[PDB]
Design an enzyme around this catalytic site. Structure first.
Site, short mmCIF file in Angstrom:
data_model
loop_
_atom_site.label_atom_id
_atom_site.label_comp_id
_atom_site.label_asym_id
_atom_site.label_seq_id
_atom_site.Cartn_x
_atom_site.Cartn_y
_atom_site.Cartn_z
N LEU A 1 0.83 -1.20 0.00
CA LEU A 1 0.00 0.00 0.00
C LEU A 1 0.86 1.25 0.00
O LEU A 1 1.84 1.35 0.76
CB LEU A 1 -0.92 0.01 1.24
CG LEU A 1 -1.78 -1.26 1.37
CD1 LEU A 1 -2.65 -1.16 2.63
CD2 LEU A 1 -2.66 -1.48 0.10
N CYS A 2 0.48 2.25 -0.81
CA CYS A 2 1.27 3.47 -0.93
C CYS A 2 0.76 4.48 0.08
O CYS A 2 -0.21 5.21 -0.18
CB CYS A 2 1.19 3.98 -2.35
SG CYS A 2 2.08 5.51 -2.64
N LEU A 3 1.42 4.54 1.22
CA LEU A 3 1.11 5.47 2.30
C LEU A 3 2.31 6.37 2.57
O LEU A 3 3.45 6.03 2.23
CB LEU A 3 0.71 4.71 3.57
CG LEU A 3 -0.44 3.71 3.39
CD1 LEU A 3 -0.52 2.88 4.65
CD2 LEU A 3 -1.72 4.40 3.10
#
Length: 169
Positions: free
Chosen positions: A86-88
């Site tokens: 996930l791109c956080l």
């Protein structure tokens, strides 16, 4: 073997969570690999996730604390594609702005706050509020019967889940 630096830091991060457990977030290292953490987010009230049980992982790299963890969510949830990085902001999509001083609870609160927003990012998916509510209701069964790693890491929660599933019936 993890570096001594990483092992010391991540042990301390676990103790900090024991001493001040963040609401809605349980997380711990694998007992044979301090770099691989598993979490359970409990869906909060005021969201379509309310009451859901969301298992995922924070995988710290060998060069931790100088590189971010990979963040994944395993339980189907309607917000994040399962089993997908996930791109956080505090994740391994952002090594250049990584801050070694971020605590594990801070990282996980960032995941929870992002989850409950509607912002799109790499790894997010589009579903309805009703789909999210159905996935939240079914998450406990999913983790009990359709999630091989959940039982290996959280056997005590599987035992709870069996009793919860029976009390629902």
């Amino acid at each position: 073997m993890a570096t001594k630096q990483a092992h010391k830091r991540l042990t301390k991060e676990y103790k900090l969570m024991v001493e001040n457990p963040p609401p809605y977030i349980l997380a711990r290292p694998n007992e044979d690999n301090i770099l691989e953490w598993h979490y359970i987010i409990t869906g909060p009230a005021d969201t379509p996730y309310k009451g859901g049980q969301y298992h995922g992982t924070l995988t710290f790299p060998s060069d931790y604390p100088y590189k971010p963890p990979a963040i994944r969510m395993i339980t189907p949830n309607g917000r994040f594609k399962p089993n997908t990085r996930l791109c956080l902001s505090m994740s391994d999509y952002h090594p250049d702005t990584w801050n070694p001083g971020w605590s594990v609870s801070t990282i996980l609160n960032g995941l929870l706050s992002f989850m409950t927003s509607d912002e799109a990012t790499t790894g997010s998916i589009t579903t309805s509020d009703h789909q999210k509510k159905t996935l939240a209701r079914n998450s406990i069964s999913y983790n009990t019967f359709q999630n091989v790693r959940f039982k290996l890491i959280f056997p005590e929660v599987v035992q709870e889940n069996v009793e919860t599933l029976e009390k629902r019936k």
